Amino acid sequence: MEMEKEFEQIDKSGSWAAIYQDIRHEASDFPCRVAKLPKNKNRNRYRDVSPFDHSRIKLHQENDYINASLIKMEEAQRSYILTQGPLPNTCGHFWEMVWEQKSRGVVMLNRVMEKGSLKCAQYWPQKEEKEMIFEDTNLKLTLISEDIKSYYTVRQLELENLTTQETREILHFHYGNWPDQTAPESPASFLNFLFKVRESGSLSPEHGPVVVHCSAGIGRSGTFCLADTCLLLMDKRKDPSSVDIKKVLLEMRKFRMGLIQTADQLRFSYLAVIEGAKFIMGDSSVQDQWKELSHED
Ligand SMILES: [Mg+2]
Ligand SMILES: [Mg+2]
Ligand SMILES: [Mg+2]
Ligand SMILES: [Mg+2]
């Protein structure tokens, strides 16, 4: 409620840049000493995007480094793992993390090729008959089925620990038309996708944290997690007025640097949370309107 008042004030004064820059100025600064060790330089996609030591995900091998952060939202009681798009040499590490952390969903917000460059390795199989074996981490990954919609794809993957022969279903939610440094095309399209992730059960507290990534794992990934956390806070309290979006973002930034990369992504987060509030507060039919407005079919 007060977020909507604030939204119109900021819009009327045209001060989204200033609001966003103040968040950048106030954001936490913690050491990333492990990420900057020389032996880990080839495990980082971007020189300037590193996990803090205190919140980094540790692999359970005896080099434990992956560029990934546990965003542990204590008040909302939901956690997320935000990570970079894996590199050709860290795809085994990526799936090892998925296994060890007991995640059941992977949210991919980027394409492997963007703006003429490779922003993420091809870390999952594109054909049923060409499964992937990660020899370094003793994991096998098979495409089971996929559901291709107009702007996103949902894939059913089977991940097998070859040491124990345990298998798990992993759901892959792949957003197709959300470029870096931009907001999604519409709140409807974004919320339709977010609530597809929610409906899957992948965010259940009975599972490990969902894994969310884009190329760097901070911009689109931070936008996704900020919207979800704000909606969850509002949901637990049944009180949209009680949510302070900038406070929530600053809290998320205690766990990973740079979350939300542009002022328009911050503005979009307000838009998405204000619209999603309608569903949270009991206008259930609005979810059907998002699906129609998203033209997913
Ligand atoms: Mg506010
Ligand atoms: Mg097992
Ligand atoms: Mg892009
Ligand atoms: Mg934009």
Swiss-Prot record:
Modification Cysteine sulfinic acid (-SO2H) occurs at: C214
GO biological process, one term: IRE1-mediated unfolded protein response
Entry-annotated residues carrying Phosphotyrosine: Y20, Y65
Membrane disposition: Peripheral membrane protein
The entry's keywords: Acetylation, Endoplasmic reticulum, Hydrolase, Membrane, Oxidation, Phosphoprotein, Protein phosphatase, S-nitrosylation
Stretches assigned to the Tyrosine-protein phosphatase domain: 3-276
Tissues expressing the protein: Expressed in keratinocytes (at protein level).
Cross-link (N,N-(cysteine-1,S-diyl)serine (Cys-Ser)): C214-S215
E.C. code: 3.1.3.48
Positions of modified residues (Cysteine persulfide): C214
Principal localisation: endoplasmic reticulum
Subcellular location: Endoplasmic reticulum membrane
Enzymatic class: hydrolase
In-chain residues carrying the UniProt-annotated modification S-nitrosocysteine: C214
Modification N-acetylmethionine occurs at: M1
Positions of modified residues (Cysteine sulfenic acid (-SOH)): C214
GO CC, alphabetical: cytoplasm; cytoplasmic side of endoplasmic reticulum membrane; cytosol; early endosome; endoplasmic reticulum; endosome lumen; glutamatergic synapse; mitochondrial crista
Positions annotated as active site in the UniProt record: C214 (phosphocysteine intermediate)
Residue positions, PTM Phosphoserine: S50, S241, S242
Entry's Gene Ontology molecular function annotations: cadherin binding; enzyme binding; ephrin receptor binding; insulin receptor binding; non-membrane spanning protein tyrosine phosphatase activity; protein kinase binding; protein phosphatase 2A binding; protein tyrosine phosphatase activity
Coiled coil: none
Binding site for substrate: D180, C214, S215, A216, G217, I218, G219, R220, Q261
Family under the similarity heading: Belongs to the protein-tyrosine phosphatase family. Non-receptor class 1 subfamily.
General function of this protein: Tyrosine-protein phosphatase which acts as a regulator of endoplasmic reticulum unfolded protein response. Mediates dephosphorylation of EIF2AK3/PERK; inactivating the protein kinase activity of EIF2AK3/PERK. May play an important role in CKII- and p60c-src-induced signal transduction cascades. May regulate the EFNA5-EPHA3 signaling pathway which modulates cell reorganization and cell-cell repulsion. May also regulate the hepatocyte growth factor receptor signaling pathway through dephosphorylation of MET.
Summary of subunit composition and partner proteins: Interacts with EPHA3 (phosphorylated); dephosphorylates EPHA3 and may regulate its trafficking and function. Interacts with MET. Interacts with NCK1.
The protein, known as: Tyrosine-protein phosphatase non-receptor type 1
Organism, scientific name: Homo sapiens (Human)
Source lineage: Eukaryota, Metazoa, Chordata, Craniata, Vertebrata
Primary gene name: PTPN1
